[PDB]
Amino acid sequence: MPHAFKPGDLVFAKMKGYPHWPARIDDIADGAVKPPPNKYPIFFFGTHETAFLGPKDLFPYDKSKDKYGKPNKRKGFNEGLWEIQNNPHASYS
Template sequence: MGKRRRLKKTPLTDGQFVFAKMRGFRAWPGRLVNRLGTEYNVYFYGTWDHARVSQKHIFDFAKHSKRYGKVNDRNSKVCRSFRAAMLEMQLAIAEPELDIGYFNMVAHLTTGAGLPQDESYSELEMNTDSDSEEVPPKGKRIAPMYHIVGDSDSDVENNAPN
């Protein structure tokens, strides 16, 4: 009987491209956001979601792409979304500075990480572009309002005679 060799895990770094395995799902392409003890926040491509994943369920993309990057059933819905996720990840690997979904997730997780659940917006965000000095009641979430410019509905009607 032979002895089992234990594979040495390569150290993981923030921003590294990986496959992350969660219970009930196949290993999915993602990117590490930050470390939380023995777990990592992982941004998943294709779903644009994130989750905490244990270090033992995270695999380096370059080393394990042949094993976890295979598509078995060509017609299933999971297969189509997995192929789309792999394509999105390959585009992110080619141009990592244009990976907007990942950078939005990093900003979301780093700014809201230290705040309680009911106060996810900072005071700076709540008070920008506000005309009144009224402070919202504690426990209420106020999202910043955005004005969309350049849409097909104009605010000014053209009343010029024809």
């Protein structure tokens, strides 16, 4: 059975106006800005941007990849597909 989201989990994350996007739940570094309550820090592969999202916008990657893991015209998207499949836990700083 599912647990709650934890750092390191791989997802497609949904933002208004954008396709479901390859992403991971990030850790929060010591001294770094924390997310609002009930939100997680989401790192978006390809763009390398961070937003704060709740579970309603987070789709586990294994279950969802057949639907959402297809190339997209959007900037950074196909780079993001490579990252989530080939090195999802690397440092992209």
